[PDB]
């Protein structure tokens, strides 16, 4: 079935689940040709696959070479995503394989179901949550490793840093989605909020700054204000 | 010509014989159907006046024996039986005619509709889909589920249609996931035609049988099968040319025969828009497309 906010706590029970977001798999710049036409050039992309209970992000880098000589790339991208997620599941020990995969875009359902035929007991589901995972490429260290890749590559991160040492997975996911929604809504201002104190640093193995508990409360407030400010600007409220 | 006599007609009923229908009143002096063109296949079907729930009937080949109908007051339905005493049967059907309490099968000579609907339908293949080996005829009704449907609860009383499932390992070669899902030609040609049906005649025969069970009994699983078998052909980029041209004819006569007021429940909009306007064979169903647009534009 489809996921939503009635059964929202279920995301953090002990059944393993994986969100898959394909919005950054096929990425282009749109530029003008010598004959005056407009032409695309692909740039590196990524599959965003996240277990929300543990913070484990499996970031598969999609190198531009996979598109060479291919047609209908937006369609192919969904099948490429499905192929790689299926491969990820097969590479995991059985006790680590998900019981559900939740796709952020309904167009991924048939490609993933077809690639996952060998796993009849893994449920493939859409969700009715509007998740901001498209803004994953606003996280500086994720963007950097994607744009630097010269070959297909799988990179691993805990997208929650060390937060689970102090907060629940429900709370961590809420913090993540708030940060990413802010980055999606006003990227440059959201980055300013995060980097405005140069004495709070990002650990070498972390994605986010080493905020204390009280500093996170302040940051989260500033992020909620950013989002509300942009809503008011957009709708003249 | 053959005869299907009735012992009596104790309950008011609508009786179908092939594409025709007539009514019988309660305890009307009715003793069956005469003048039936021997064919290769026939169907006699029933819908009771006092309870239109359960349509039901019997597929039969007049060449495989002498068949009659007798009402069963315990089970409450008209049952087909076979008469093994031929001289007894000739004695009835050479008289009951001599009494004139039978309706005449009314075949207009211009009308080739029944073999256009059943050319590929065979009784030996029917008896594999409807498994009741002790009888030479096959009972179908409105409620019978299909083997496939049972996999998603009395297997004896099921319709054993060939399972077609576009999102199954049978349909999709490992390593060819996108290819085989977007172009079902492998599944059609290697798996279904070469592997299971053996030739297109057997394929069209099940397709035709499924259509007729959907139309005559309102059997939902049959409708699913009919549509699935159309969609498999239309979703294949590579189909023999004889098969496409023959499919257009087969579908045209099915659409032509369909009751006009039954289109909301016997035609799946998604499937038909895909086959006529989006599929590999959108340009190969010229006559079907023309009858569909001029008879059922609202669906499209
Ligand atoms: O939980 C941690 O922080 C260490 C494990 O981190 C992983 C992250 C992605 C995949 C696998 C493990």
Domain ranges for chain A: 9-163, 164-237
Residue contact B177–A83, C-beta within 8 A: yes
Residue where a domain terminates, one of B88, B122, B143: B143
Ligand 1 atom nearest residue A57's Cα: 9
Indicate if B163 and B124 belong to the same structural domain: no
Architecture of domain A9-163: 2-Layer Sandwich (3.30)
Pair (B18, B100) in one structural domain: yes
Q: Which of B99, B118, B143 is the last residue of a domain?
A: B143
Number of Cβ within a 10 Å radius of residue B79: 14
One domain, residues B139 and B171: no
Tokens of B125: 């293949």
Instruction: From B94, B120, B143, give the residue that closes a domain.
Output: B143
* Ligand 1 closest atom vs CA A160: 3
Alpha-carbon distance values, A156 to A23, A47, A58, A230, B145 (Å) = 19, 12, 5, 33, 49
Asked whether residue B58 falls in the same domain as residue B180, the answer is no
Three-state DSSP state, A202: strand
Residue with structure tokens 């070498």? A204
Q: Residue A56: CB within 6 Å of ligand 1?
A: yes
Shared domain check, B295 and B157: yes
How remote is the C-alpha of A79 from its chain's centroid?
18
Asked how this structure was determined, the answer is: X-ray
Does B169 sit within 8 Å of A114, measured CB to CB? Answer: no
Work out whether the CA dihedral A139, A145, A148, A154 comes out positive or negative: negative
Q: Do residues B132 and B173 both lie within one domain?
A: no
Contact of B194 with chain A, judged by CB distance below 8 Å, is answered with: no
* B119 plus B185 within the same structural domain: no
Residue B47 exposed, middle or buried by CB count within 10 Å (0-12, 13-18, 19+): buried
Same domain membership, residue B165 and residue B208: yes
Cα distance between residue A235 and residue A232, in whole Å? 5
Residue B120 CB partners (closer than 8 Å, separation 6+): B201, B202, B204, B205, B207, B208, B250
Cα separation, B147 vs B150, whole angstroms: 5
Residue A173 CA, ligand 1 centroid: distance in Å:
15
Asked if B214 contacts B223 with a C-beta cutoff of 8 angstroms, the reply is yes
**B134 and B282 share one domain:** no
> What pairing do the DSSP bridges indicate for beta strands A100-103 and A17-21?
parallel
Structural contact between residues A147 and A139, judged by C-beta atoms closer than 8 angstroms: no
Window A:159-198, CB contacts with B under 8 Å: none
DSSP calls for chain B = -EEEEBS---S-EEEEETTEEEEE-TT----EEEEE---S-EEEEEEETTEEEEEEEEEE-GGG--EEEEEETTTTEEEEEE---HHHHHHHHTTHHHHT-SEEP---TT--HHHHHHTT--HHHHHHHS--TT-SSEEEETTPPBHHHHT---GGGSB-PPP--SSSTTT--TT-HHHHHH-THHIIIIIIIIIIISSHHHHHHHHHHHHHHHHHH--HHHHHHHHHHHHHHHT-S---HHHHHHHHHHHHHHHHHS-GGGHHHH--HHHHHIIIIISTTTTS-HHHHHHHHHH-GGG-
Angstrom distance (rounded) from CA B56 to CA B213:
10
Tell me how far apart the alpha carbons of residues B216 and B230 are, in angstroms, rounded to a whole number: 19
- Give the chain B residue nearest A79 (alpha carbons): B178
**For residues A207 and A176, what is the distance between their CA atoms, to the nearest angstrom?**
11
Contacts of A87 (CB under 8 A, 6+ apart): none
Chain B: residue whose CA lies nearest to A114: B167
Same domain, B136 and B183: no
d(CA A184, CA B261): 52
For the domain spanning A164-237, the CATH number is 1.20.80.40
Tokens of A46: 């990524």
B218 Rama sector, left if φ>0, alpha if ψ -120 to 50, beta otherwise: left
Separation CA A147–CA A125 (nearest Å) = 30
Tell me the CA distances in angstroms from A180 to A102, A166, B118, one per residue in order: 18, 20, 62
How many CB pairs below 8 Å do chains A and B form together?
A: 23
Residues B135 and B160 in one domain: no
- The answer to whether residues B40 and B139 belong to one domain is yes
Give the residue numbers spanning the domain of B5. Answer: 1-143
Instruction: Please check whether residue A110 touches B, CB under 8 A.
Output: yes
Which distant-in-sequence residues (6+ apart) come within 8 Å of B289 by Cβ? B276
User: Cα B214 from chain centroid?
Assistant: 7
């Amino acid at each position: 079935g489809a996921m939503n906010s009635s059964n929202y706590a279920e995301l953090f029970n002990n059944d393993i689940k994986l969100f898959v977001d394909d919005t950054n798999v096929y990425r282009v710049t749109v530029h003008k040709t010598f004959e005056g036409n407009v032409a695309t050039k692909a740039i590196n992309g990524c599959i965003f696959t996240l277990n929300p209970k543990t913070g484990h992000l499996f970031l598969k880098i999609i190198h531009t070479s996979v598109w060479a000589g291919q047609k209908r790339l937006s369609q192919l991208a969904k099948w490429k995503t499905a192929e790689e997620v299926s491969a990820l599941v097969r590479s995991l020990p059985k006790e680590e394989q998900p019981k559900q995969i939740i796709v952020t875009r309904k167009a991924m359902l048939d490609p993933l179901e077809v690639h996952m035929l060998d796993f009849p007991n893994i449920a493939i589901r859409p969700t009715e949550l509007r998740l901001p995972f498209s803004a994953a490429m606003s996280i500086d260290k994720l963007s950097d490793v994607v744009m630097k890749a010269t070959e297909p590559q799988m990179v691993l991160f805990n997208i929650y840093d060390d937060w689970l040492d102090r907060i629940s997975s429900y709370t961590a996911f809420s913090r993540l989605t708030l940060l990413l929604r802010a980055l999606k809504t006003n990227e440059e201002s959201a980055k300013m909020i995060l980097l405005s104190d140069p004495t709070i640093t990002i650990k070498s193995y972390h994605l986010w700054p080493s905020f204390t508990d009280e500093q996170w409360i302040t940051i989260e407030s500033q992020m909620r204000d950013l989002i509300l400010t942009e809503y008011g600007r957009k709708y003249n409220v | 010509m053959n005869t299907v006599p009735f012992t009596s007609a104790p309950i008011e009923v609508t009786i179908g014989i092939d594409q025709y229908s007539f009514n019988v009143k309660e305890n009307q002096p009715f003793h069956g159907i005469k003048d039936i063109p021997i064919g290769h296949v026939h169907v006699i079907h029933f819908q009771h006046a006092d309870n239109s729930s359960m349509r039901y009937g019997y597929w039969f080949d007049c060449r495989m024996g002498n068949f009659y109908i007798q009402y069963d007051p315990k089970d409450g339905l008209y049952k087909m039986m076979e008469e093994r005493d031929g001289a007894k049967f000739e004695n009835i059907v050479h008289n009951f005619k001599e009494r004139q309490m039978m309706v005449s099968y009314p075949k207009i000579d211009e009308d080739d509709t029944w073999y256009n609907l059943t050319e590929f339908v065979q009784m030996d293949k029917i008896r594999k889909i409807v498994r009741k080996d002790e009888n030479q005829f096959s009972y179908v009704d409105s409620s019978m589920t299909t083997v496939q449907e049972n996999e998603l609860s009395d297997p004896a009383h099921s319709l054993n249609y060939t399972v077609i499932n576009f999102k199954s390992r049978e349909a999709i070669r490992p390593g060819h996931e996108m290819e085989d899902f977007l172009d079902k030609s492998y599944y059609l040609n290697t798996v279904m035609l070469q592997g299971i049906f053996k030739n297109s005649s057997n394929y069209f025969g099940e397709l035709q049988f499924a259509f007729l069970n959907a139309m005559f009994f309102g059997n939902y699983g049959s409708s699913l099968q009919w549509h699935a078998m159309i969609e498999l052909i239309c979703s294949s980029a590579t189909v023999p040319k004889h098969m496409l041209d023959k499919l257009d004819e087969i579908l045209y006569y099915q659409i032509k025969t369909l009751p006009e007021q039954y289109s909301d429940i016997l035609l799946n909009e998604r499937v038909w828009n895909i086959c006529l306007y989006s599929s590999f064979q959108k340009n190969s169903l010229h006559n079907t497309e023309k009858i569909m647009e001029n008879k059922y534009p609202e669906l499209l």
